[PDB]
Every structure is written in structure tokens, then in C-alpha cells.
Amino acid sequence: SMQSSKRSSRSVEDDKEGHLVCRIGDWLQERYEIVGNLGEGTFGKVVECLDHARGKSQVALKIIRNVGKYREAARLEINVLKKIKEKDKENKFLCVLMSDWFNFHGHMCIAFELLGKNTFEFLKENNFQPYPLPHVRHMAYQLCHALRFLHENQLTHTDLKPENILFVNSEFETLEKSVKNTSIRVADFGSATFDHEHHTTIVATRHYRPPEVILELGWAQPCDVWSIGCILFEYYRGFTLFQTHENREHLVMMEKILGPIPSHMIHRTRKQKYFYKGGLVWDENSSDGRYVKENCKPLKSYMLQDSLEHVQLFDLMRRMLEFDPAQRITLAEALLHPFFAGLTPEERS
Numbered sequence: 001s002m003q004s005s006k007r008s009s010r011s012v013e014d015d016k017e018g019h020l021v022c023r024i025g026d027w028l029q030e031r032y033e034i035v036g037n038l039g040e041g042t043f044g045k046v047v048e049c050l051d052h053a054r055g056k057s058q059v060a061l062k063i064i065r066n067v068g069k070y071r072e073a074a075r076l077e078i079n080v081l082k083k084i085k086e087k088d089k090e091n092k093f094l095c096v097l098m099s100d101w102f103n104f105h106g107h108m109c110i111a112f113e114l115l116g117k118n119t120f121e122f123l124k125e126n127n128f129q130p131y132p133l134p135h136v137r138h139m140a141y142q143l144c145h146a147l148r149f150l151h152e153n154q155l156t157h158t159d160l161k162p163e164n165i166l167f168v169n170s171e172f173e174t175l176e177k178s179v180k181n182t183s184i185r186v187a188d189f190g191s192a193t194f195d196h197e198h199h200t201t202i203v204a205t206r207h208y209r210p211p212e213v214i215l216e217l218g219w220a221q222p223c224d225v226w227s228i229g230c231i232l233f234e235y236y237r238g239f240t241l242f243q244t245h246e247n248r249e250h251l252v253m254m255e256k257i258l259g260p261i262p263s264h265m266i267h268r269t270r271k272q273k274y275f276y277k278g279g280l281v282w283d284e285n286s287s288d289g290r291y292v293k294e295n296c297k298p299l300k301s302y303m304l305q306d307s308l309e310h311v312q313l314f315d316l317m318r319r320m321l322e323f324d325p326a327q328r329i330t331l332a333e334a335l336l337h338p339f340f341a342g343l344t345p346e347e348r349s
């Protein structure tokens with residue numbers, strides 16, 4: 001219910017978890033009026049606010065717990081978001097960057113422009129009926145465009161997944177639900193790592209994680225290209241390419257679907273226990289063996305239609321899913337792939 005901004009903004013306390021005790025109608029900075037809850041987690045809470053210094057426009061305000069490790073992780077996210085903003089003065093490269101950040105009584109707070117549903121939540125709301133190829137194509141183009149910019153500015157996202165890709169507007173027609181506008185933005189730069197910085201060993205979410213990270217061979221921009229390839233497959237079929245929670249099984253799935261791992265990646269890994277005489281150790285006859293052999297087929301076998309536009313998609317996905325990160329297509333190269341000849345002039349600009 002409605003409260004005054006000066007009063008609400010100074011009336012403040014935390015709970016035993018170091019969350020800010022707040023509810024709908026509370027204010028921050030005599031500026032942000034809380035009108036809803038967007039999400040929550042170990043880090044803190046995300047609340048929808050009206051921004052009264054900007055005609056009451058909607059924002060997603062992330063409010064971090066009064067806990068040191070979450071405070072410090074947010075400070076890093078903020079420093080990445082500042083560096084991206086300073087490289088993209090005018091926001092041509094489709095990242096969800098901050099509109100504001102401040103320290104509210106030990107709470108790091110980060111404001112973002114409020115966008116629509118993420119590409120996972122839209123798919124779930126459609127009963128996991130996949131995106132039509134034209135939408136996959138436009139979305140593919142935008143991901144390539146966004147990450148290419150970051151990549152050529154010595155940055156790697158490391159955690160691209162459908163939940164971190166947002167529709168500017170997720171309003172839909174019923175034809176299956178079909179989004180009216182396929183414009184997307186790339187979110188969640190908390191893990192993003194510059195070329196010169198320490199690379200944490202295990203990056204990406206399981207389904208989107210490339211072989212060089214599983215085998216601990218060193219990772220860079222190509223990690224994001226593998227993630228994008230997995231994302232395009234899931235947009236196109238509506239289920240993840242790699243339905244697994246264990247490295248050995250995951251690598252076997254990669255072989256069943258993409259062909260053999262290059263021998264020099266097997267030779268270089270510390271993870272020798274996954275291999276015997278240079279081949280993956282795997283029981284074809286076990287319960288998991290039977291499941292993988294029935295469910296994990298060559299990548300081309302997942303095509304829904306045979307027309308050229310579908311061949312072009314599957315060829316680009318093959319290139320984004322090359323085992324050897326040195327041989328994997330770059331996003332600069334991907335943008336020249338003939339799959340993108342199919343974009344409308346409107347999508348292409």
C-alpha cells in the first residue's frame with residue numbers, strides 16, 4: 001500500500017539472513033518504489049520498482065544481502081557492467097546493463113530496465129513446444145551480435161543459458177504461442193571474465209558447458225560459442241541437447257552426437273581416468289548405456305524439416321559445437337554464415 005518516500009527510505013532493518021526487511025510500497029533513495037517481486041535467491045532479492053526520478057518507468061532492482069561474499073560478488077558484477085557500458089556508450093550490443101547502482105545500508109543494489117520473460121520461461125509457458133526456425137534464426141543472430149562485441153573487447157560471459165536471455169517484450173499471439181517480437185537481450189554478467197583475469201576452473205551451467213572446461217584444458221571466448229550452440233538446439237527442439245549431470249556420461253553424449261574428441265584433447269587432460277587406450281570408458285549395456293544409446297543420436301538426426309534453412313541451422317550448430325575450441329567458429333565468422341541470409345532486412349538491421 002502507498003507510503004511516503006523520505007519516511008520509507010530512512011525506516012530500515014535486516015533480518016537474521018542479512019536480507020533487507022521490506023515489502024510492496026517501501027522506497028529506496030527517495031526514488032525507487034517497490035511494486036512487486038521478480039525473483040529471489042542466496043544472493044538477495046530482485047523487486048520490481050517504479051523509478052520516480054524517470055517518469056515512474058519500471059526497473060528490476062537487485063537487492064543483495066548484507067553478507068560479505070554476496071556484497072563482493074555484486075561489486076565485481078558492477079565493475080564488469082561499468083566496463084561494458086563504457087565500451088557501448090549507446091547500447092547497440094543488446095546487453096542488459098545497469099541504469100543505477102548504490103549501497104543501501106550495506107545492501108548493494110543494482111537497477112536494470114525491466115524487460116519480459118526469459119527464453120526458458122516463454123518455452124516452459126508454451127509446454128516446451130519449440131520456437132519456429134525464423135525465431136531461432138533472429139535470436140541466433142542477436143546472440144552472435146551481442147557476444148561478438150564482448151569477445152572482441154577481451155570478455156567472455158561464461159554462463160550463457162536460456163534463463164539469461166530475455167525478450168524485450170514477451171507478448172505473444174496464439175496461431176502454440178508465438179512471441180510477437182523476437183528482440184532479446186543478454187543478462188547476468190556476474191561470472192564474466194576478461195582475458196587477463198584469473199579464469200575459475202569450472203564455468204557455465206552443466207547443459208551449456210564445453211568439453212575444454214570438463215577436461216580442464218583452459219577456456220576463453222569459444223566457451224560462449226559452445227553454450228550458444230546448445231541454446232540454439234534447445235530453442236529448436238525445446239529440450240536440452242545434453243540431458244546429463246556427470247562429466248564422463250556428458251563426454252560420451254558429445255561423442256554419440258558430434259563424433260570423436262580430438263586425440264590431443266584426450267592426451268592433454270589430467271582426467272585420464274575417463275579414458276582407456278585413448279577411448280572413453282563407457283558400458284553400452286548398463287542402464288545409462290541403454291538410455292544414452294536410445295536417446296543420443298548424430299546431431300543431424302534432430303532436424304525437424306529437410307529444407308535448406310534447416311540444413312543451414314544444423315551446419316552453424318555443428319560449427320559452434322566443434323570439440324576443439326581453436327577450430328570452433330568465432331561469432332565474427334558465425335555472423336557471415338549463410339544461415340543468416342534468411343533474416344528479414346528488419347531483423348538484419
Ligand SMILES: CCN1/C(=C/C(C)=O)Sc2ccc(OC)cc21
Pocket residue numbers: 038039040046060062096112113114115116117166187188
Ligand atoms: C529476476 C530477473 N532479473 C534479474 C535477476 C538477477 C539474478 O540478476 S536481473 C533482471 C533485469 C531485467 C529484468 O527484466 C524482467 C529481470 C531481471
Ligand SMILES: [Cl-]
Pocket residue numbers: none
Ligand atoms: Cl579426480
